[model samples]
Target: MSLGSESETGNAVVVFGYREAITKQILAYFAQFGEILEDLESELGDTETMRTPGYFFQQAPNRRRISREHGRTWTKLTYANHSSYLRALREHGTIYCGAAIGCVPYKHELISELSREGHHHHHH
Candidate 1:
């Protein structure tokens, strides 16, 4: 019972729709295969829309595409604040997550700079 080629691939069919417990067992059953093939988990999420959401939309259990129109990339879980700004390298960090959740007021020194050149740039 060995699958030895990347070309020979398969997909699993779940009998139960999608529940956290079932999902976990499925994941455990999967990791046993150790890269034999990979499956992306997609669970049904909250079906509501508003100013914000209880969960961040993700593509598959792995990650998601940031998408377009001022698009960006998805990343690991983290929090951002002014401290994480220029403080890192005098140059370190885009389409950030925190701000995506709410309105972020402009905070760069020199008000008119943001007033004039803000649209050309971005902030948290």
Candidate 2:
């Protein structure tokens, strides 16, 4: 189910379904988001529903139609810059830890800082 923002009601949930291949990609993307959700859940002691195509389909049985506006919004958001992505993490209270963790190897300064903080000396 997808949620639409409403002024007083907060967000209204919308649901849609997709082909299996598209569903796989959606699931993969959501899994990456799930890692961030896990971090937030641990830190803030709050529960969040991680976005998954399977879960959405399960919740909304007859959501096979995708709204064009939603699709356009998704496409636009998909190409967002780093700052925008970080903003989303902040807004969601979920760090994109998967991407950040994957980037640690390429960011020597991060590794150095971690080492200085006595976290670990291992860079690899």
Candidate 3:
């Protein structure tokens, strides 16, 4: 629960990073607050139980579902508006991990300063 924020009544929460195994972690985290309903449970890949007929990729034994779940086939099916497709869809969003940039390495000097500065006390 390091940087996690939650409602005082334990209704909602938001956690950063750790896309590694969030399905398992999210379910257990909310369990302490007494089952957070369908929307919460349905946020992750595994918890989606609408029974869609999208592509399933499992050629490897130890592959992660997040990386393997989506492909060209699934995208076409989802775009075709088939009932068998997933009821919901999502994006991973954007992440910016550099200094302010513009014309011709505008922020390089600032970034160099940050490297020697106290960001790892710390920051990106």
Candidate with maximal TM-score:
2
**Per-residue error (Å), model 2, residue 30:** 12
Give a tens-digit lDDT track for model 2, residues 1-124. Answer: 1434432111122112222334433334443332211111122123335332232312222542322113211211221234324332233333333322121111223334434544423442
Pairs that clash in candidate 1: none
Residue range 1-124, candidate 1, lDDT tens digits? 2455442111211111122333334434322221111233432234322111223432343443321111121111111323322121111121122222111232223233433433433552
Task: Return the clash pairs for model 2, or none.
Answer: 2-14, 17-63
How many residue pairs clash (N, CA or C atoms closer than 3 angstroms) in each of the candidate models, in the order given?
0, 2, 2
- State every prediction's TM-score relative to the real structure: 0.16, 0.22, 0.19
By TM-score, the candidates rank as 2, 3, 1
- C-alpha lDDT values of all predictions: 0.25, 0.27, 0.27
Off by over 4 Å in 2: 1-32, 36-84, 88-107
Kindly report which residue stretches of model 1 are placed more than 4 angstroms away from their true locations once superposed.
Answer: 1-16, 34-62, 65-124
User: For model 2, how big is the CA root-mean-square deviation?
Assistant: 17.6
- Per-residue lDDT of 10-38 in model 3, one digit per residue for the tens? 21122222222333543344232222112
